[model samples]
Target: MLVAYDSMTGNVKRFIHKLNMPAVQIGEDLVIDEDFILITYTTGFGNVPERVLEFLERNNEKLKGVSASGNRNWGDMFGASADKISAKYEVPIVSKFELSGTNNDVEYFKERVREIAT
Candidate 1:
């Protein structure tokens, strides 16, 4: 099932839209047809909102795959979420940055994602 949060920034929402990936919330009971899930959300101070966390904590095991916005150390979030879901579900996190924006971290983030995915 394609699940989305009630509140999400336009950037994340648009990104999810562009990717054409299905999404689901934490509380929803889902039978994942595809092993992958594209999750989009904004963060403050590198932490997901409480509601998102609750959902993530609930469905952590079933989430075989996920993609997220480049908010803080999303790599950590991906790993943490994977752990919650189950050790069997290896998490691969993908991220992107604004074309015009200047953040040296973008390259680092991309590098990290590449390394993590491998």
Candidate 2:
């Protein structure tokens, strides 16, 4: 599945880059033709980024799962975007990452994707 992502500080981008999986950025002009999992970041007090919402509003029909990147300082607020997206979009969450994710994080994330991949 395509790993479509929304990365502001490039942390999510770096993580996906390491995975060597099929990936593309979530953008205003991007047009996806395949099923995908979303990898996004949490925003202020655990909110989804505007760009991500717009992308989802338009392309959620093909979305298979969601993942997230963010800091843990907010505690309960961590993984906010991932949870919100998964719930609101009615899709499962594949992973929850901190910043760019670690080696083990990447490995486990890949495994989750593989299990659900079609």
Candidate 3:
């Protein structure tokens, strides 16, 4: 299993860092055949990033779940990238955070991952 992610403004990247777990970025040309969770940032107006879309298109089955970051100010659109991806890929949305996320968010995410691991 692994953690894969994408980021803009470094929020998702920073969140991944706080996870302190090994992770890889999309478009990094890495071969991933094991189960993995995605931690990604939402794009403009509740959109999933194109790179993440492409990655999912190619590797949806290996995904166990998704976590997303977005501006809570977007109201209904907050962290919607995870929702969109979850809808399309049938992967559960595990964490939806406002920005880089707090320690609680990271722990919650880790707990979900632990469940998957177990």
The per-prediction CA RMSD against the true structure, in angstroms, equals 6.9, 0.9, 1.2
Candidate 2 has what TM-score? 0.96
Ranking by TM-score: 2, 3, 1
Q: Candidate 3 overall Cα lDDT vs. reference?
A: 0.88
TM-score for candidate 3, please give it.
Answer: 0.94
Which stretches of model 2 miss by more than 4 angstroms?
none
Residues forming the 10-long window of minimal summed lDDT in candidate 3:
25-34
- Please give, for residues 1-118, the per-residue lDDT of candidate 2 as tens digits: 6899988889999999989998988898777788898999999989999999998888998899999998898799998999999999899989988999999989988999998895
lDDT of each: 0.43, 0.90, 0.88
Each candidate structure's TM-score, on Cα atoms with residue i matched to residue i, is 0.48, 0.96, 0.94
lDDT of 1 by residue, 66-101 (tens): 444544345554324323323334555444343222
Model 2 residue 71 CA deviation (Å) reads 1.1
64 Cα displacement, candidate 3 (Å): 0.6
The per-candidate count of clashes, in order, stands at 4, 0, 0
Which of candidates 2 and 3 is the stronger one according to lDDT?
2
lDDT (C-alpha) at residue 31 in model 1: 40
